[PDB]
Short mmCIF file of C-alpha atoms in Angstrom, two decimals:
data_model
loop_
_atom_site.label_atom_id
_atom_site.label_comp_id
_atom_site.label_asym_id
_atom_site.label_seq_id
_atom_site.Cartn_x
_atom_site.Cartn_y
_atom_site.Cartn_z
CA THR A 1 0.00 0.00 0.00
CA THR A 2 3.02 2.27 0.64
CA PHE A 3 5.69 2.16 -2.08
CA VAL A 4 9.30 3.35 -2.23
CA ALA A 5 10.91 5.01 -5.22
CA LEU A 6 13.85 3.06 -6.60
CA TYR A 7 15.03 5.90 -8.87
CA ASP A 8 14.81 9.63 -9.29
CA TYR A 9 12.06 10.72 -11.65
CA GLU A 10 11.78 14.21 -13.13
CA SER A 11 8.35 15.39 -14.19
CA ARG A 12 7.85 15.80 -17.92
CA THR A 13 4.38 17.36 -17.80
CA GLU A 14 2.11 19.27 -15.43
CA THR A 15 0.31 16.11 -14.33
CA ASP A 16 3.14 13.77 -13.35
CA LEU A 17 4.84 13.67 -9.97
CA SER A 18 8.56 14.27 -9.58
CA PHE A 19 10.24 12.22 -6.88
CA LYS A 20 13.69 11.30 -5.63
CA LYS A 21 15.10 7.85 -4.95
CA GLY A 22 13.89 6.71 -1.53
CA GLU A 23 10.68 8.73 -1.41
CA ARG A 24 7.60 7.06 0.09
CA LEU A 25 4.51 7.11 -2.14
CA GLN A 26 0.88 6.03 -1.68
CA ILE A 27 -1.17 5.07 -4.70
CA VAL A 28 -4.45 6.88 -5.21
CA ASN A 29 -7.46 4.74 -6.02
CA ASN A 30 -9.50 6.59 -8.63
CA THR A 31 -12.10 6.05 -11.30
CA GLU A 32 -9.81 6.29 -14.32
CA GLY A 33 -7.79 3.22 -13.37
CA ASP A 34 -4.15 2.73 -14.17
CA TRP A 35 -2.99 4.48 -17.31
CA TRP A 36 -1.48 2.61 -20.23
CA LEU A 37 0.43 3.77 -23.28
CA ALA A 38 -1.75 2.91 -26.23
CA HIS A 39 -1.94 3.12 -30.02
CA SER A 40 -5.20 3.73 -31.88
CA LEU A 41 -5.76 1.35 -34.76
CA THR A 42 -8.55 3.63 -35.89
CA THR A 43 -6.66 6.92 -36.02
CA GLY A 44 -2.96 6.02 -35.80
CA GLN A 45 -2.56 8.36 -32.83
CA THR A 46 -0.64 7.25 -29.76
CA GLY A 47 -0.50 8.20 -26.09
CA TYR A 48 -1.70 7.40 -22.60
CA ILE A 49 -5.21 6.21 -21.89
CA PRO A 50 -7.22 5.56 -18.73
CA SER A 51 -7.58 1.79 -18.52
CA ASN A 52 -11.07 1.83 -17.06
CA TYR A 53 -12.38 3.35 -20.34
CA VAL A 54 -11.60 0.26 -22.44
CA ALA A 55 -12.27 -3.47 -22.51
CA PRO A 56 -10.66 -6.38 -24.38
CA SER A 57 -11.75 -7.08 -27.96
CA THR B 1 -4.21 -7.67 -26.64
CA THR B 2 -6.59 -5.46 -28.67
CA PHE B 3 -8.97 -3.35 -26.57
CA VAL B 4 -12.13 -1.40 -27.39
CA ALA B 5 -13.02 1.98 -25.98
CA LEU B 6 -16.24 1.97 -23.98
CA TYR B 7 -16.47 5.78 -23.78
CA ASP B 8 -15.27 8.90 -25.49
CA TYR B 9 -12.15 10.37 -23.92
CA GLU B 10 -10.87 13.88 -24.62
CA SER B 11 -7.18 14.53 -24.12
CA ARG B 12 -6.29 16.80 -21.23
CA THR B 13 -2.56 17.07 -21.92
CA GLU B 14 -0.08 16.69 -24.76
CA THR B 15 0.76 13.11 -23.77
CA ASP B 16 -2.64 11.44 -23.51
CA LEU B 17 -4.58 9.92 -26.37
CA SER B 18 -8.04 11.13 -27.33
CA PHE B 19 -10.39 8.44 -28.56
CA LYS B 20 -14.06 7.90 -29.36
CA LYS B 21 -16.35 5.16 -28.11
CA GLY B 22 -15.75 2.04 -30.21
CA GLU B 23 -12.15 2.75 -31.18
CA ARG B 24 -9.73 -0.19 -31.25
CA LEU B 25 -6.56 0.29 -29.18
CA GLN B 26 -3.38 -1.74 -28.67
CA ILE B 27 -1.41 -1.35 -25.47
CA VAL B 28 2.26 -0.48 -25.80
CA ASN B 29 4.67 -2.49 -23.70
CA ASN B 30 7.31 -0.10 -22.41
CA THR B 31 9.90 0.30 -19.69
CA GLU B 32 7.99 2.75 -17.51
CA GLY B 33 5.19 0.31 -16.75
CA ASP B 34 1.61 1.30 -16.10
CA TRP B 35 1.19 4.74 -14.57
CA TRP B 36 -0.50 5.26 -11.24
CA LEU B 37 -1.81 8.37 -9.51
CA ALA B 38 0.31 8.76 -6.42
CA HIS B 39 0.85 10.99 -3.39
CA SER B 40 4.29 11.68 -1.92
CA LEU B 41 4.45 11.25 1.82
CA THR B 42 7.81 12.97 1.72
CA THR B 43 6.84 16.12 -0.16
CA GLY B 44 3.03 16.24 -0.14
CA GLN B 45 3.02 16.54 -3.93
CA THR B 46 0.63 14.45 -6.00
CA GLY B 47 0.45 13.20 -9.57
CA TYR B 48 1.12 10.32 -11.92
CA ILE B 49 4.15 8.07 -11.57
CA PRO B 50 5.66 5.30 -13.66
CA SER B 51 5.02 2.10 -11.71
CA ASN B 52 8.29 0.43 -12.66
CA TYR B 53 10.19 3.12 -10.70
CA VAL B 54 8.81 2.04 -7.29
CA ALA B 55 8.52 -1.04 -5.11
CA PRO B 56 6.37 -1.89 -2.08
CA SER B 57 7.52 -0.73 1.36
#
């Protein structure tokens, strides 16, 4: 339930969290679900999606 | 391996993918892992993190 960072991470956008190796993090349950990097076979566009918006074929 | 969108999603940043209900999506394996919304107990900051950078307490 409480995780520890193994590496530094520097934020690349306004929505991600920067953290330093050793920081203690708690995951936030939320309605979007985990986010996955995805590719649209319909549009050819690519980027992150909220997993709770999709289902398997 | 191939997912279907259950809902429209409109992109909120430059890194997320917009898609319409019914679109067909493939997930992209990558080194960051799934992303989780997280809260830093060290800094009080909050936002998304790459899951493969952390481990359980």
